[PDB]
Amino acid sequence: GTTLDNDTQSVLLYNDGTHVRVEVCTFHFCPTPVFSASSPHLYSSAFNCTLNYTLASVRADFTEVDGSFKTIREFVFKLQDGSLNVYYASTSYVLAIGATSQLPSGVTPLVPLWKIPIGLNITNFKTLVYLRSDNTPLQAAYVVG
């Protein structure tokens, strides 16, 4: 979105656990939008909502996995004529917990996944994560370029 509050429309693209849903609605967002216990704690309300459908049916659980980092999931988001184009590729990347933080070497091409007709001005974005039942963040990392 642009201001990420209830005077403008915002795009809500996320995985609820069984599906990938995109919602372009006017969200009264929480001060920190975050999943708590595989339950949405993202917005208080959403009224003027122009787009609401599921993009894909993938089974992503909310279970903590012990050990080191296993995979890297890379995304490219770009706006082209009012549509949000998503490019995606996932690669096996074994990175230790206390190791030096760096991106993998080589080239992994990202395939075009979706073209979402949001029809919005996008100047800012925020990341949605999930915590444990006691609202404690998990072991993860994300990169923005």
Binding site: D7, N48, T50, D81
Partner: protein
């Protein structure tokens, strides 16, 4: 060079059993306001459009990036239908490279727009004797809209020293003049011959003929060549393949999802050997290759 003429015709379209919702997008009970224009996803349907000849007629049918007469033999990728109500004199603003209140603040088309713009007079459906005030348009935005961008937020703006709403009400009266009468506008946007498609014209696709020079038609892309089985693996977002020149040398068949190589029919150098004219009429032909 030795030419081989095509003998058969191969048409391969994805198998679609449904007509496109022409009555849903052209005969809808309510149309959106132009500032809050509705976009409808169109997929897995046959774009016949000759079923509209019986009932409806259009004042504007400008098409961009494609000829109107070629629409029946094509397949369309990423089809959207944008519907709104605009005034009669603002219909011409629904075009690429236009300025005006609608093009700046309500609905902007891309400069490289591919698609068709449809419009028809919507009096006695959106106009009343006492006046219809259910349709709104933006009057000010502080920034011109980008193509296919929508702004439905409610905010005021400063006119002199006071603050007025940026949304202005359409006054649609019966017998108000054709330039001030309501018009329903449908904008169809798509891309052609570059990606897998699910919306196609009525073409009656035929069987696959291989190892012969045929006139092919794959998802609207016509041509002449020889179809052969290919050991190419398309990556499920690709429909056509290109060689070092921009030439379609392979295609994914839309019914059986296998890749077929496309090979030109004409090949091989040909030269003729003759003595002089008025010495002989016999010739010898050297077929290289």
């Amino acid at each position: 060079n030795f030419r081989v003429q095509p003998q058969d015709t191969v048409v391969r379209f994805p198998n679609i059993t449904n007509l496109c919702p022409f009555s849903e997008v052209f005969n809808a009970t309510t149309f959106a306001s132009v500032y809050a224009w509705n976009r409808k996803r169109i997929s897995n349907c046959v774009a016949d459009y000759s079923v509209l000849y019986n009932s409806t007629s259009f004042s504007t049918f400008q098409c961009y990036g494609v000829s109107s007469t070629k629409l029946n033999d094509l397949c369309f990728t990423n089809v959207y239908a944008d519907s709104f109500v605009v005034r009669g004199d603002e219909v011409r603003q629904i075009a690429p490279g236009q300025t005006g209140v609608i093009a700046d603040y309500n609905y902007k088309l891309p400069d490289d727009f591919t698609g068709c713009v449809l419009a028809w007079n919507s009096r006695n459906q959106d106009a009343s004797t006492s006046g219809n005030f259910n349709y709104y348009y933006r009057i000010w935005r502080s920034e011109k809209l980008r193509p296919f961008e929508r702004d439905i937020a409610h905010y005021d703006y400063q006119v002199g020293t006071q603050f007025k709403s940026s949304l202005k009400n359409y006054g649609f009266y019966s017998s108000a003049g054709d330039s001030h009468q309501p018009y329903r506008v449908v904008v169809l946007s798509f891309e052609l011959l570059n990606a897998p498609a699910t919306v196609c014209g009525p073409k009656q696709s035929t069987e696959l003929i291989k190892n012969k020079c045929v006139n092919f038609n794959f998802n609207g892309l016509t041509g002449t060549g020889v179809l052969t089985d290919s050991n190419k693996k398309f990556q499920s977002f690709q429909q056509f393949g290109r060689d070092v020149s921009d030439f379609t040398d392979s295609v994914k068949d839309p019914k059986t999802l296998e890749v077929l190589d496309i090979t030109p029919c004409s090949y091989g150098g040909v030269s003729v050997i003759t003595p002089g004219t008025n010495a002989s009429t016999q010739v010898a032909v050297l077929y290289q290759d």
